[PDB]
Design an enzyme around this catalytic site. Structure first.
Site, mmCIF file in Angstrom:
data_model
loop_
_atom_site.group_PDB
_atom_site.id
_atom_site.type_symbol
_atom_site.label_atom_id
_atom_site.label_comp_id
_atom_site.label_asym_id
_atom_site.label_seq_id
_atom_site.Cartn_x
_atom_site.Cartn_y
_atom_site.Cartn_z
ATOM 1 C CD1 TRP A 1 122.722 58.987 44.535
ATOM 2 C CD2 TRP A 1 123.797 58.046 46.317
ATOM 3 N NE1 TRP A 1 122.268 57.776 44.737
ATOM 4 C CE2 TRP A 1 122.860 57.184 45.774
ATOM 5 C CE3 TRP A 1 124.550 57.630 47.405
ATOM 6 C CZ2 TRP A 1 122.630 55.914 46.284
ATOM 7 C CZ3 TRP A 1 124.338 56.357 47.918
ATOM 8 C CH2 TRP A 1 123.392 55.517 47.370
ATOM 9 C CE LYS B 1 123.461 52.954 39.960
ATOM 10 N NZ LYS B 1 123.987 54.000 40.846
ATOM 11 C CG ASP C 1 129.656 56.581 45.155
ATOM 12 O OD1 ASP C 1 129.454 55.684 44.348
ATOM 13 O OD2 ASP C 1 128.806 56.879 45.983
HETATM 14 C C1 PLP Z 1 124.082 53.780 42.089
HETATM 15 C C2 PLP Z 1 124.899 54.638 42.998
HETATM 16 C C3 PLP Z 1 125.363 54.173 44.249
HETATM 17 C C4 PLP Z 1 125.010 52.749 44.757
HETATM 18 O O1 PLP Z 1 124.924 51.824 43.844
HETATM 19 P P1 PLP Z 1 124.105 50.505 44.183
HETATM 20 O O2 PLP Z 1 124.996 49.467 43.570
HETATM 21 O O3 PLP Z 1 122.811 50.660 43.469
HETATM 22 O O4 PLP Z 1 123.998 50.498 45.648
HETATM 23 C C5 PLP Z 1 126.054 54.979 45.071
HETATM 24 N N1 PLP Z 1 126.280 56.224 44.659
HETATM 25 C C6 PLP Z 1 125.929 56.709 43.432
HETATM 26 C C7 PLP Z 1 126.280 58.054 43.045
HETATM 27 C C8 PLP Z 1 125.234 55.916 42.579
HETATM 28 O O5 PLP Z 1 124.833 56.349 41.406
#
Ligand code: PLP
Ligand code: PLP
Lengths: 396, 396
Positions: free
Chosen positions: A130, A246, A211
């Site tokens: 990311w 998500k 994460d």
């Molecule tokens: C979506 C995501 C985040 C952060 O998610 P939010 O809730 O939108 O801040 C962090 N790292 C990865 C890889 C993601 O896909």
């Protein structure tokens, strides 16, 4: 003061949402940020969160400040989800969780925490990862180093190389892992690789930072948690930055969690009083709405059941679009075999497109994709499948 | 990793909310955090924000991510409020505003911004000031220096001393001001002092950072903005961290604003692309609910009119409690003249109590106050007035 401040670069994912917005062509297609769309290409607010908000409208009495760490019910539900109901991290009171403004807020609170209360100098992130990972740890004061991950010729995880790369991370260093649905590749470790990886982490003294942003999007809620649970069982200490953006379609309400775990009750509580101090020097205490919505659905059987069906509907619709996409590229005369994307988990496809094919697709066909070749399969509907596939073949 | 992390101190204001919570005595009284209570000692959600949420429940279609800076309507309304409808900062497109998670989030985004894109080394804060000011700028990398402000014997602002103190801040340094309702003293500059102060700022080259968290709580919305507008007229550059927590009773939804202003359209936009980069490396984009609620009330005439009556009701109820409090302390045998508190603006009283009188009031009478002697007059109702006044007299 501001005279020679130069302009920052466009954000690789958010900058596209802006460019997409400014385009005037009636047939443009988005494929960039990881937001889910349904069969009609809309991003609906889930029925279950809509039922939870109606309830919150009837039943709230105050908007009075939450504590530094958020809603208690919210962190307890989060620990169940991440580690299993009746886990020993839960039962031995080894885990503490602060409610944060999304999983990004969770990554930075963790960063801040480690930068100010630990010996950590270096975080280790996969290549590719990311784009924003580097940016959050660098703001904290931390150095980012990368490890080997994806075999692009073979379209696989290169575990030997991932081991050898990581062989030069020292004891004391943080190693970041994606819980499931690796972003951008979509390739995850097996259970056997996750456990090999868990036992190597401990003989080397790496602190694991997970994460976890796509739980429920590869195989199921619990199945997606196995890797982390395999690490939780070996480790005295972990920190996991988790999100509900998500899997709850709650993107702009900003709802996630930084859960911290230490060897025992006393250490975790002492380590967390500093984590709450980093929060207080940043946004002070977290937004209630989104987190009260999660807590309500997760607390109620009826409302939980509706939500899990919703998330099952989303995993399945992405899986049909994934298959549709390699089928249509093949019968549209794709001059490459694209069926490796059938194997990737998550919202995305790491397509193999070069930066200039990706550039040319937005400039003359108006289909927006990230320049690493990452395309959002959850942005694909039956109605725009043939257009974007025709666009892609024309640039190969 | 976490073995010798020692415990952080209790937060001087949030730590009290915890201690208050744990107390078992049926008659305890709160007087600590600055949250408004009504005649019944409840903190209600305002009728106007409740009408706005019903509307948002009927009319939202998505929870899809907002841009890095928030809702456009939200920042435009904020500029009207802060600078006047049809201001020249608005008309010359000199001001840009990011929507943040409360005014604390606004203070840190500003801090981050300045620390990473400016020559600033030092922020100057009044003595006394909000306890957390020091903590947010120190996390950013900035040094905090204090200037003279309050004459405690006389219960006044000591302007000569405030001038002389500030006489050793250099060009390039930030000077923090409270827009109105100085926290904790409640003593504000006059219009004549604000303009004297505005013209000295510019001949010395201090960058003004306004903390504006109580607009509408001293005299009215617009009247409370005069000082800042007097600075806006002299200055090419300003940054204001503003909040809607108190004036909208929206405390836990986290809603505020960091508005940045430079000499022209080009400079402000280039300076803001870096401010949006600091946001993206922290919580990425802001919570929608609270900010959509503000934007809805401020956008609608009916709904705005209800809200301003509500805030007028709150200013007036605090003003009657302020007067009640010095009246009752006098007829309860107060062994000091307390009528200087009639003159202070805001939710608070800076009472004059020493740390050990304040300590003894929580330990044997259960009335909670901040240890600087700061008491929340908006926490006073007719029903607990005699109890807390009797408690105070017993410790003097
Ligand atoms: C979506 C995501 C985040 C952060 O998610 P939010 O809730 O939108 O801040 C962090 N790292 C990865 C890889 C993601 O896909
Ligand atoms: C309330 C307040 C803030 C922050 O406001 P929130 O919107 O609650 O974050 C900052 N400074 C002062 C002086 C305040 O009173």
């Amino acid at each position: 003061m501001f005279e020679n401040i130069t302009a920052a670069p466009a954000d690789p994912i958010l900058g596209l949402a802006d460019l997409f917005r400014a385009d005037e062509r009636p047939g443009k297609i988005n494929l960039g940020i990881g937001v889910y769309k349904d069969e009609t290409g809309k991003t609906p607010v889930l029925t279950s969160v809509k039922k939870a908000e109606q309830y919150l409208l009837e039943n709230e009495t105050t908007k009075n400040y939450l504590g530094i760490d958020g809603i208690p019910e919210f962190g307890r539900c989060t620990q169940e989800l991440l580690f299993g109901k009746g886990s020993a991290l839960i039962n031995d009171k080894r885990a503490r969780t602060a409610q944060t403004p999304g999983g990004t807020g969770a990554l930075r609170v963790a960063a801040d925490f480690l930068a100010k209360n630990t010996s950590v100098k270096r975080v280790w992130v996969s290549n590719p990862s990311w784009p924003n990972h580097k940016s959050v740890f660098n703001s904290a004061g931390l150095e980012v180093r990368e490890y080997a991950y994806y075999d692009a010729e073979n379209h696989t995880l290169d575990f030997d190389a991932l081991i050898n790369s990581l062989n030069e991370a020292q004891a004391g260093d943080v190693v970041l892992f994606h819980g499931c649905c690796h972003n951008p590749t979509g390739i995850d470790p097996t259970l056997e690789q996750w456990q090999t990886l868990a036992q190597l982490s401990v003989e080397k003294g790496w602190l694991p930072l997970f994460d976890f942003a796509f739980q429920g999007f590869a195989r199921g809620l619990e199945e997606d948690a196995e890797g982390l649970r395999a690490f939780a069982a070996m480790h005295k200490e972990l920190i996991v930055a988790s999100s509900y953006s998500k899997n709850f379609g709650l993107y702009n309400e900003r709802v996630g969690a930084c859960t911290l775990v230490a060897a025992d009750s006393e250490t975790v509580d002492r380590a967390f009083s500093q984590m709450k101090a980093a929060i207080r020097a940043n946004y002070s205490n977290p937004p209630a709405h989104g987190a009260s919505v999660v807590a309500t659905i997760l607390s109620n059987d009826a409302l939980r059941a509706i939500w899990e069906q919703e998330l099952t509907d989303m995993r399945q619709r992405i899986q049909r679009m994934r298959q549709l996409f390699v089928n249509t590229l093949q019968e549209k005369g794709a001059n490459r075999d694209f069926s490796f994307i059938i194997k990737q988990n998550g919202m995305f496809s790491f397509s193999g497109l070069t930066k200039e094919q990706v550039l040319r697709l937005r400039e003359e066909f108006g289909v927006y994709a990230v320049a690493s070749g990452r395309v959002n399969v959850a942005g694909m509907t039956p109605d725009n499948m043939a257009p974007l596939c025709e666009a892609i073949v024309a640039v190969l």
